[PDB]
């Protein structure tokens, strides 16, 4: 039948840019279109549930985070800016596919933790069994009592590294991968365990807004 005609919708979009919080280095991550702020559904309301999924290599400037994409959720918006908070962290799928090789065991743990705020996180971890130098046998499998003991010490150490961090302190904690060195130093009297990672931090529920804390996080 008869369908519709056209009116160009990129005249009524607005180019808001996105600011990253002060936990990172250089923090102007990009821009975003949204419909212009008319009355009855303004733009600052059509935002604020928007996440951007950017790469930590850009958010830190150095290339040795070329994996590890992180998510920023828009919460405050002012001055044609977007004021974003830490909403997640992932790996790219080709990272963990570049890690998994057979004749070893992958131990993985995940805890449901609450930070020093009323944020709750499901934070994951993966860790691959290593064969030592001077090991002749090809396998280096774990004996599954060692898998329980390693998963226990991993769950204990990352539920201790949260509850003792804020989201600012925890994003600042998982920028220079230092929970990984904590896990490895805690684990090296059970099994060797090459390339421990955290692989995933999931926001589950967030406390309230607290605009002053958001603005203090930014600066």
Partner 1 sequence: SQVFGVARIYASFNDTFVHVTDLSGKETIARVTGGMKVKADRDESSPYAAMLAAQDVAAKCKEVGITAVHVKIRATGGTRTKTPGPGGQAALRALARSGLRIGRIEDVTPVPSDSTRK
Partner 2 sequence: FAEESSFMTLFPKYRESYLKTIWNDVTRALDKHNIACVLDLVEGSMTVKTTRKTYDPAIILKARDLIKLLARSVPFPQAVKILQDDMACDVIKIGNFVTNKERFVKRRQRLVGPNGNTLKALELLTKCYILVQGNTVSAMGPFKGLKEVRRVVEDCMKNIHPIYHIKELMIKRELAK
Where along the sequence are the contacts to RNA (CB under 7 A)? 3-4, 6, 49-51, 53, 71, 96-97, 100-106, 108-109, 132-141, 143, 146, 148-149, 151-152, 185, 188-192
User: 117-143 in b/e burial notation, b at 16+ Cβ within 10 A?
Assistant: bebbbebbbbbbbebeeeeeeeebebe
What is d(CA 76, CA 130) in angstroms, rounded to the nearest whole number?
45
Q: Judged by CB, which is closer to partner 2: 99, or 190?
A: 99
How remote is the C-alpha of 143 from its chain's centroid?
31
Considering the complex, what minimum distance in angstroms separates the CB of residue 104 from partner 2?
11
Region binding partner 1 by CB under 8 A among candidate stretches 23-31, 112-120, 126-134, 183-191: 23-31
Name the site residues for partner 2 (rule: CB under 8 A): 63, 66, 94, 97-99, 101-103, 138
3-state secondary structure of 139: coil
Count of residues binding partner 1 (CB under 8 A)?
19
Residue 164 sits at the vertex; the CA angle it makes with 161 and 167, to the nearest 5 degrees, is 85
Region binding partner 1 by CB under 8 A among candidate stretches 51-59, 112-120, 124-132, 211-219: 51-59
Quick check: 202 binds partner 1 (CB under 8 A)?
no
Residue 63 binds which entry of partner 2, RNA, partner 1, none, CB below 5-8 Å type-dependent: partner 2
The breaks in the chain (C to N more than 2.5 Å) occur after: none
3-state secondary structure of 6: coil
Binding residue for partner 1 (CB under 8 A) from 52, 99, 149, 175? 52
Contacts of residue 163, Cβ cutoff 8 Å, sequence gap at least 6: 113, 114, 115, 116
Residue 219 binds which entry of RNA, partner 1, partner 2, none, CB below 5-8 Å type-dependent: none
Quick check: 51 binds partner 1 (CB under 8 A)?
yes
Considering the complex, what minimum distance in angstroms separates the CB of residue 4 from RNA?
4
Quick check: 13 binds partner 1 (CB under 8 A)?
yes
CB 61 within 8 A of CB 52: no
- Tell me the two tokens of residue 42: 């303004």
């Amino acid at each position: 039948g008869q369908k519709k005609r056209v009116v160009d919708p990129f005249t009524r979009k607005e180019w808001f840019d996105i600011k990253a919080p002060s936990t990172f280095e250089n923090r102007n991550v990009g821009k975003t279109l949204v419909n212009k702020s008319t009355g009855l559904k303004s733009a600052s309301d059509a935002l604020k549930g928007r996440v951007v999924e950017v790469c930590l290599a850009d958010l830190q400037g150095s290339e040795d985070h070329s994996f590890r994409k992180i998510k920023l959720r828009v919460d405050e918006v002012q001055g044609k800016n977007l004021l974003t908070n830490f909403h997640g962290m992932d790996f790219t799928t080709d990272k963990l596919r570049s890690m998994v090789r057979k004749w070893q065991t992958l131990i993985e743990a995940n805890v449901t933790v609450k930070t020093s705020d009323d944020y709750v996180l499901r934070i994951f971890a993966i860790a691959f069994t290593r064969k030592q130098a001077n090991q002749v046998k090809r396998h280096s499998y774990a004996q599954s009592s060692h898998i329980r003991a390693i998963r226990k010490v991993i769950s204990e150490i990352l539920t201790k590294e949260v509850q003792g961090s804020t989201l600012a302190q925890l994003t600042s904690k998982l920028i220079p991968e230092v929970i990984n060195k904590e896990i490895e130093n805690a684990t090296k009297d059970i099994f060797p365990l090459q390339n421990i990672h955290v692989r995933k931090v999931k926001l589950l529920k967030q406390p309230k807004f607290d605009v002053g804390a958001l603005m203090a996080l930014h600066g």
